[PDB]
PDB file of C-alpha atoms in Angstrom:
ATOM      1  CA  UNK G   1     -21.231  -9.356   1.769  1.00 27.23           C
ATOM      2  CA  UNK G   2     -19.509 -11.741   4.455  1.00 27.91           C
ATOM      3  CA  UNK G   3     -17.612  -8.767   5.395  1.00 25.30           C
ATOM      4  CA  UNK G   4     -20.825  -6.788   6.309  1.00 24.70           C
ATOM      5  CA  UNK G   5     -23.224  -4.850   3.902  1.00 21.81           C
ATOM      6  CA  UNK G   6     -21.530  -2.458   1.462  1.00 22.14           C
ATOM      7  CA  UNK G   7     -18.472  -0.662   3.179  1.00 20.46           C
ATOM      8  CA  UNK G   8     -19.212   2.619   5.489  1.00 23.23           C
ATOM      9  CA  UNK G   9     -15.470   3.515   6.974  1.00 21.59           C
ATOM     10  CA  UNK G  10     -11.858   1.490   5.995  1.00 21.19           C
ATOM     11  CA  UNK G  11      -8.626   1.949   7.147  1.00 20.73           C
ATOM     12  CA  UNK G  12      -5.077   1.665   6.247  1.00 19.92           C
ATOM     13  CA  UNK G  13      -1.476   2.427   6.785  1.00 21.33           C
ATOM     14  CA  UNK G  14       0.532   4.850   5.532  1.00 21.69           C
ATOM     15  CA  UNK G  15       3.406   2.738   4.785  1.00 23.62           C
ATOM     16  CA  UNK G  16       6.590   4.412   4.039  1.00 24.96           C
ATOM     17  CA  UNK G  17      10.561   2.849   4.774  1.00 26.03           C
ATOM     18  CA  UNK G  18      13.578   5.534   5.474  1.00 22.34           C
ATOM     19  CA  UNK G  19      17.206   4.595   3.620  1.00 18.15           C
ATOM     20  CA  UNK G  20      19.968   5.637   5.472  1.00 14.98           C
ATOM     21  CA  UNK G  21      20.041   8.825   3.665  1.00 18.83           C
ATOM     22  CA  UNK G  22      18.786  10.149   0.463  1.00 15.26           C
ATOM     23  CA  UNK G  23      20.595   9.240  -2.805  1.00 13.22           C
ATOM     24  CA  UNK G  24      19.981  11.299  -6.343  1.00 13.31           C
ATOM     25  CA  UNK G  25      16.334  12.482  -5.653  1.00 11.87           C
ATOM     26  CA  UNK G  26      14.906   9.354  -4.093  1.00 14.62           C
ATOM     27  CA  UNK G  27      14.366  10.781  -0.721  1.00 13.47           C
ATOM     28  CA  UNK G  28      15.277   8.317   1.809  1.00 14.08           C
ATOM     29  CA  UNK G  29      12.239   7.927   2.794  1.00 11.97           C
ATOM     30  CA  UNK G  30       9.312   5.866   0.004  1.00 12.10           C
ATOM     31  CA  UNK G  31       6.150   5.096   0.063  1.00 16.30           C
ATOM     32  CA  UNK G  32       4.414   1.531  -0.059  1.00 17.45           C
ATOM     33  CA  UNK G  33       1.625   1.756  -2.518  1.00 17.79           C
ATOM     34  CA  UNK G  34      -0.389  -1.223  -3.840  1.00 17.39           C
ATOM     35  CA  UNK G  35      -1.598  -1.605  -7.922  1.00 17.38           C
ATOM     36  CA  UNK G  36      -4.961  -3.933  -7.902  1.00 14.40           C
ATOM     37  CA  UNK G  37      -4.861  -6.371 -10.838  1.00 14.04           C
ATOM     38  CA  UNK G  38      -8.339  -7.944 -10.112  1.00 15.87           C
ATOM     39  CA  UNK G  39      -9.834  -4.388 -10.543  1.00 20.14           C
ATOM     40  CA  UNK G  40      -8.979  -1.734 -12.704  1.00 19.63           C
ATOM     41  CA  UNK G  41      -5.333  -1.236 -12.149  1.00 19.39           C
ATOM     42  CA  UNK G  42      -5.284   1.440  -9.648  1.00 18.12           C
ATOM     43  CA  UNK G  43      -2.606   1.967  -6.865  1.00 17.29           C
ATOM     44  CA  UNK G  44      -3.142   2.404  -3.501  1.00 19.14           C
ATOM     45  CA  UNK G  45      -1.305   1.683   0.123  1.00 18.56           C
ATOM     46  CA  UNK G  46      -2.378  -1.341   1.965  1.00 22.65           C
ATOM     47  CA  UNK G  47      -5.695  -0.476   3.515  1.00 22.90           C
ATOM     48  CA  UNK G  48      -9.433  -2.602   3.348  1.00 22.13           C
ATOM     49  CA  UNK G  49     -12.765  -1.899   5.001  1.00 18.15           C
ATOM     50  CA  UNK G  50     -13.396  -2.228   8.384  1.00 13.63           C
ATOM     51  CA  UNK G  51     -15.776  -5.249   9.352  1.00 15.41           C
ATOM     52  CA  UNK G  52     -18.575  -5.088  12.164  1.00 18.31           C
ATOM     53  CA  UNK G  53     -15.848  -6.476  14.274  1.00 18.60           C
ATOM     54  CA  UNK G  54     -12.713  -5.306  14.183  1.00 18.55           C
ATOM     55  CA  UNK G  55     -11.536  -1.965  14.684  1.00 15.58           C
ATOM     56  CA  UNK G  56     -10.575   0.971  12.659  1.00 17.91           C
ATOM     57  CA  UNK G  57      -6.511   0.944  13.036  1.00 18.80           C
ATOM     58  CA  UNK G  58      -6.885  -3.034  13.588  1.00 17.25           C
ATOM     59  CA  UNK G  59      -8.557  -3.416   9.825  1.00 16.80           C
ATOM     60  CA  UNK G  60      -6.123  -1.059   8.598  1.00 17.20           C
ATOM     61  CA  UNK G  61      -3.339  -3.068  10.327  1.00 17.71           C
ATOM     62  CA  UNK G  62      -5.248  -5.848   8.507  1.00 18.07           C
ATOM     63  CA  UNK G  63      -5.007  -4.805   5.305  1.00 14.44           C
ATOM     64  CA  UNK G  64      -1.484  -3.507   5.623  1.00 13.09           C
ATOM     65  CA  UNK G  65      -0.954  -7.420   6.916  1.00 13.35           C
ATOM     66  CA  UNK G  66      -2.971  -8.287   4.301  1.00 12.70           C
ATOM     67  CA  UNK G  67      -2.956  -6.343   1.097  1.00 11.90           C
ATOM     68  CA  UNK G  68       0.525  -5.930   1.001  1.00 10.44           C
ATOM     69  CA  UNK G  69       1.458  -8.912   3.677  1.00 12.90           C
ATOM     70  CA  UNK G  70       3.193  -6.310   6.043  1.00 11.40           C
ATOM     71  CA  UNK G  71       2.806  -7.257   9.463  1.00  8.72           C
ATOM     72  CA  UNK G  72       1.888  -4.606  12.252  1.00 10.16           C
ATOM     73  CA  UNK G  73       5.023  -6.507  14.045  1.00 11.42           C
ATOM     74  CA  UNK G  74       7.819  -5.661  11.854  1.00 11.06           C
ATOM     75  CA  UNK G  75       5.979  -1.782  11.393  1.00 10.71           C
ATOM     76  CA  UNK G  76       6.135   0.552  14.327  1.00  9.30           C
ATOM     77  CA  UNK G  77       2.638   3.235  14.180  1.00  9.21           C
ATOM     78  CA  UNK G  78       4.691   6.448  14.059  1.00  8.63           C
ATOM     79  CA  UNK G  79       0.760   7.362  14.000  1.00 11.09           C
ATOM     80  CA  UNK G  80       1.215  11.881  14.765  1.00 11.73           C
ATOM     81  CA  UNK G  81      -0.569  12.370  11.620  1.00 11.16           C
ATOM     82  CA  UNK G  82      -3.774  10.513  10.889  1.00 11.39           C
ATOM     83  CA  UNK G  83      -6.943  11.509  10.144  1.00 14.28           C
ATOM     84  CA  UNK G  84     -10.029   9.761   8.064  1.00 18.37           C
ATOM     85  CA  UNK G  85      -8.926   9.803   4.488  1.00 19.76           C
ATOM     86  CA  UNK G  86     -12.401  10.188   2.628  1.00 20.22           C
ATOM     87  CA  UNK G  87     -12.297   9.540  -1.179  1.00 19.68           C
ATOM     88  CA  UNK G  88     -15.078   8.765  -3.838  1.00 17.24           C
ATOM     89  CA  UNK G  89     -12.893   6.958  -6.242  1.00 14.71           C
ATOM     90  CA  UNK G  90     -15.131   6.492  -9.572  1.00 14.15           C
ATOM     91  CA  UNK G  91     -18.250   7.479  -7.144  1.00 11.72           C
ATOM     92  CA  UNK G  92     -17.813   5.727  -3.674  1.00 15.72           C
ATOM     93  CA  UNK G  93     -16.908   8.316  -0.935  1.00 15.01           C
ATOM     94  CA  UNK G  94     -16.888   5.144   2.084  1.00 14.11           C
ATOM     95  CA  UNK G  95     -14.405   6.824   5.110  1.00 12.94           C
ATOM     96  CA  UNK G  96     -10.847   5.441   5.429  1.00 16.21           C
ATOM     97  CA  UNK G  97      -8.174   6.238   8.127  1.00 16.52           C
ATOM     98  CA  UNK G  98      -4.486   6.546   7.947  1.00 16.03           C
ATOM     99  CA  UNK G  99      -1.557   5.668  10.111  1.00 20.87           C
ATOM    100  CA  UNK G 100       2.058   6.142   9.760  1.00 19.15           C
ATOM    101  CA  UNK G 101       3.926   3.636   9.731  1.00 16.76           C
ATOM    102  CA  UNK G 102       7.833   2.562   9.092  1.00 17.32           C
ATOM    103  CA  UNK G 103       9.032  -1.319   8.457  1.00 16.45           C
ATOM    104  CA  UNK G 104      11.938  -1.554  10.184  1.00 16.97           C
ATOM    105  CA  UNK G 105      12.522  -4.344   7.903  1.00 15.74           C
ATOM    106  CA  UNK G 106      14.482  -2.611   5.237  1.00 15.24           C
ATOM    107  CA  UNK G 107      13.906  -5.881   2.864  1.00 14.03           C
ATOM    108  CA  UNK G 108      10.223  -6.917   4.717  1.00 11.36           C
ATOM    109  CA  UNK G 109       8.400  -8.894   2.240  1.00 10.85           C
ATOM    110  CA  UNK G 110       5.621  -7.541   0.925  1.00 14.01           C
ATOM    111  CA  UNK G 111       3.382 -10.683   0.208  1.00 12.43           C
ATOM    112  CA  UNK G 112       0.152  -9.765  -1.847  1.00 12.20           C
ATOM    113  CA  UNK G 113      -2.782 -11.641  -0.827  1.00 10.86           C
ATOM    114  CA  UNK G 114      -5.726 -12.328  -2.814  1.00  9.59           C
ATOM    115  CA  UNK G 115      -6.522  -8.742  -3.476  1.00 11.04           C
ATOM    116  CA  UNK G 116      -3.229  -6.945  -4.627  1.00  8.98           C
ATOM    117  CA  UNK G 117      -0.310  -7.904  -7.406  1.00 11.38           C
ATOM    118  CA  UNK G 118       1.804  -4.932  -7.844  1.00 10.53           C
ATOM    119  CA  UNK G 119       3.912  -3.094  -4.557  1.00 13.73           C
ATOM    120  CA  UNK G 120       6.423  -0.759  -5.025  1.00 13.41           C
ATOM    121  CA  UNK G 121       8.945   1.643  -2.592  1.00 12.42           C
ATOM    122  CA  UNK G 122       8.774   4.825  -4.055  1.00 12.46           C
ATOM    123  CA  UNK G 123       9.285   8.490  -2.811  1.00 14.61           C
ATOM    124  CA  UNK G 124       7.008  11.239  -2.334  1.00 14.42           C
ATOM    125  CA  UNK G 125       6.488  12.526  -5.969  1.00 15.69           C
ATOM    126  CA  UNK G 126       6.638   9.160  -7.224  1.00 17.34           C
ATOM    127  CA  UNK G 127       3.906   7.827  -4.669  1.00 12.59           C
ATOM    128  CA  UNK G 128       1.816  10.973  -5.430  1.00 11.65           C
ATOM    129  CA  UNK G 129       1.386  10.147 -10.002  1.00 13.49           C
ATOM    130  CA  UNK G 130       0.513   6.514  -8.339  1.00 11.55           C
ATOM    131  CA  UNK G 131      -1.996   7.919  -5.419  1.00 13.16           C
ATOM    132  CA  UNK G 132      -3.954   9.697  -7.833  1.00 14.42           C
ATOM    133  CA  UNK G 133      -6.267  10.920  -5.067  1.00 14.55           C
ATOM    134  CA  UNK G 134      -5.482  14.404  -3.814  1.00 17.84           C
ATOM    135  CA  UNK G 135      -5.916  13.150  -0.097  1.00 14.89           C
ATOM    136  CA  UNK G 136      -3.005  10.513  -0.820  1.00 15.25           C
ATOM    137  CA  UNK G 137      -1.067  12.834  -2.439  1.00 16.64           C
ATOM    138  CA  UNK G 138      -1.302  15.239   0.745  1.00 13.26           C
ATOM    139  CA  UNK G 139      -1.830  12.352   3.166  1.00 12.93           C
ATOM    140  CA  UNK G 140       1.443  10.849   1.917  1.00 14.84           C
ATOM    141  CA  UNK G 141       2.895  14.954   1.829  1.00 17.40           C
ATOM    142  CA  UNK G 142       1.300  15.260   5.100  1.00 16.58           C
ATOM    143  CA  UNK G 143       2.535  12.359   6.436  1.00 17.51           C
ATOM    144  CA  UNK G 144       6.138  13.282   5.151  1.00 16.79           C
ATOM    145  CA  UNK G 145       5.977  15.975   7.351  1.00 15.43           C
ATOM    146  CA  UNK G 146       5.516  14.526  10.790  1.00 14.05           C
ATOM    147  CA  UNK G 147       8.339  12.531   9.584  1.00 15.04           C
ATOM    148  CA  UNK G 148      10.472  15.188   9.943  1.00 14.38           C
ATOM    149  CA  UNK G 149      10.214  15.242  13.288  1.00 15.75           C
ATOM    150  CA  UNK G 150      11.006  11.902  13.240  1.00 18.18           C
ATOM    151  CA  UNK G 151      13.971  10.089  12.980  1.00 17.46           C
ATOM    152  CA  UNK G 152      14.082  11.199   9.178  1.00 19.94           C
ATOM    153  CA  UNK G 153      16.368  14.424  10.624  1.00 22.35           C
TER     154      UNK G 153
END
C-alpha cells in the first residue's frame, strides 16, 4: 500500500558467510535464510519488494539491512552470479533479484526487523530443505559456484 500498489519486481541478497575451512559436512561456506513468523512460517534470505523509489540491488540491500538487519557495509556484493529470481510462492510470481554477498563479520548480528523472527547459517543442502523454491535451491547452488572462484579455494 504505502510501499506502492501490489509488488511487481523485489530483490534480495544472497547471503552466505565462509569458515575458515569446512568441518564434518558443514561446508565452510552457509547460507543466511530468514523463517517469517507473522506469515506462514516459511524461510527465505533477506530480500523485500522494491518501492517506486529505490532501486533493485538498493531494496534488496534493504531488505538484507532490514529483514535480517545485515548491513550492505559489513557485506561485500561478490555479485558474478545474479539474475531475477522469479517465484509464485502459493500463487504470486512478482520478480526478485539476487546478489552474492559475504559478511565479513563472522559474528554480524543478524537483527530481525518487523518482518522476520527466525535466521539461521546453514550450508548448501541445509539452506536448500529451508528454500523450498527450486530457484533458491539452484540460486543458492548457483551461487555456490561462483564462489568457487572466489576466495572459497
Amino acid at each position: 500500500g504505502p510501499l506502492g500498489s501490489m509488488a511487481l519486481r523485489a530483490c534480495g541478497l544472497i547471503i552466505f558467510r565462509r569458515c575458515l575451512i569446512p568441518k564434518v559436512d558443514n561446508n565452510a561456506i552457509e547460507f543466511l535464510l530468514l523463517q517469517a513468523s507473522d506469515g506462514i512460517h516459511h524461510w527465505t534470505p533477506p530480500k523485500g519488494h522494491v518501492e517506486p523509489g529505490e532501486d533493485d540491488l538498493e531494496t534488496a540491500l534493504r531488505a538484507t539491512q532490514e529483514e535480517a538487519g545485515i548491513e550492505a557495509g559489513q557485506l561485500t556484493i561478490i555479485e558474478g552470479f545474479k539474475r531475477e529470481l522469479n517465484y509464485v510462492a502459493r500463487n504470486k510470481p512478482k520478480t526478485v533479484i539476487y546478489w552474492l554477498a559475504e559478511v565479513k563479520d563472522y559474528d554480524v548480528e543478524i537483527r530481525l526487523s518487523h518482518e522476520h523472527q527466525a535466521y539461521r547459517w546453514l550450508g548448501l543442502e541445509e539452506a536448500c530443505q529451508l528454500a523450498q523454491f527450486k530457484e533458491m535451491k539452484a540460486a543458492l547452488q548457483e551461487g555456490h559456484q561462483f564462489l568457487c572462484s572466489i576466495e572459497a579455494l
